Amino acid sequence: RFVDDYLPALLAQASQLISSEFHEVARQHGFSVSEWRVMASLAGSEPISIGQLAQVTVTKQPTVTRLLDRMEARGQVERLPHESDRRITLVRITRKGLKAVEHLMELAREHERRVLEPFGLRRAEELKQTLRQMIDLHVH
Amino acid sequence: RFVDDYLPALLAQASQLISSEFHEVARQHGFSVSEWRVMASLAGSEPISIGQLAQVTVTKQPTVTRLLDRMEARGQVERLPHESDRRITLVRITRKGLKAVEHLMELAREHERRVLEPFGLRRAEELKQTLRQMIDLHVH
Numbered sequence: 706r707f708v709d710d711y712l713p714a715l716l717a718q719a720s721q722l723i724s725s726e727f728h729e730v731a732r733q734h735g736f737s738v739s740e741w742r743v744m745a746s747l748a749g750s751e752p753i754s755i756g757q758l759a760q761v762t763v764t765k766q767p768t769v770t771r772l773l774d775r776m777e778a779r780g781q782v783e784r785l786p787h788e789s790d791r792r793i794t795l796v797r798i799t800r801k802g803l804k805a806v807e808h809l810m811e812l813a814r815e816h817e818r819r820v821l822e823p824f825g826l827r828r829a830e831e832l833k834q835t836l837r838q839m840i841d842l843h844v845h
Numbered sequence: 846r847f848v849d850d851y852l853p854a855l856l857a858q859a860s861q862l863i864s865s866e867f868h869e870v871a872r873q874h875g876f877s878v879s880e881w882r883v884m885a886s887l888a889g890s891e892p893i894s895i896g897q898l899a900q901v902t903v904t905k906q907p908t909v910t911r912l913l914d915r916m917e918a919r920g921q922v923e924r925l926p927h928e929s930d931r932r933i934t935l936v937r938i939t940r941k942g943l944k945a946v947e948h949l950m951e952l953a954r955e956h957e958r959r960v961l962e963p964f965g966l967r968r969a970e971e972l973k974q975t976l977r978q979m980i981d982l983h984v985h
């Protein structure tokens with residue numbers, strides 16, 4: 706059957722199944738999916754643009770802006786002007802947001818280790834390498 | 846940074862970027878994303894359950910049921926009773942739906958070939974193999 710080997714379908718199914726496993730943990734720790742994606746994407750990062758955040762969190766930019774309105778109100782993130790461009794807003798995690806998400810990030814790493822363990826280090830690194838190359842070739 | 850190598854984030858970004866490329870083609874041919882996923886998942890398939898269709902199309906089951914209401918009204922799919930279980934509904938593509946989607950499926954195969962060409966046959970097959978194994982290990 707067409708769908709059994711069609712790459713976009715395989716990527717989307719694998720992504721949904723693994724992510725839905727971790728979302729149960731995230732919600733048990735008081736996070737929504739979008740809050741978790743934003744804080745995990747910003748943790749240990751320099752400030753990035755709203756558009757970059759939208760791409761890496763796979764969230765539409767108007768949705769991200771509304772999310773940042775409330776996460777900034779809760780002191781978990783901060784928006785800042787671009788040092789040069791008046792049309793670009795940067796965003797960073799605050800210390801409060803980092804402390805809020807650090808434990809969950811450790812649980813995320815453990816869950817990822819469990820997902821990748823049956824494949825071995827070689828196949829795991831090959832998968833991550835291929836995905837990174839694909840993203841860098843298709844990002845706008 | 847955590848997010849740069851986190852497998853669920855890599856899978857979701859790669860999936861979104863590649864799929865969004867093909868969705869432009871699908872809509873130019875008059876398909877919505879959900880209609881394309883249903884018809885492509887059913888093409889060349891025996892009847893499958895609603896729950897199976899929801900999993901492979903990564904669409905919530907109530908959403909799939911509403912979608913099938915209108916696709917069945919347009920004669921593109923047919924729901925049928927399970928030969929044994931009264932609690933299971935099966936669904937299939939009709940000849941009309943297959944003829945509607947066949948050309949688009951060829952374009953999908955060409956787009957996939959372009960996406961995978963830089964990686965080579967070995968890395969492409971390794972990726973598809975790993976994704977299939979991951980789905981089969983995490984599907985409920």
Ligand SMILES: O=C(O)CCc1c[nH]c2ccccc12
Pocket residue numbers: 708711713714715717718864865867878881882883885886901902903
């Ligand atoms: O490209 C998409 O629309 C998402 C990938 C995808 C998930 N399930 C699918 C079933 C058939 C064709 C494509 C898909």
Ligand SMILES: O=C(O)CCc1c[nH]c2ccccc12
Pocket residue numbers: 724725727738741742743745746761762763848851853854855857858
């Ligand atoms: O697990 C998810 O919520 C989807 C995967 C995902 C996409 N972008 C992300 C950014 C940070 C952490 C996880 C993700």
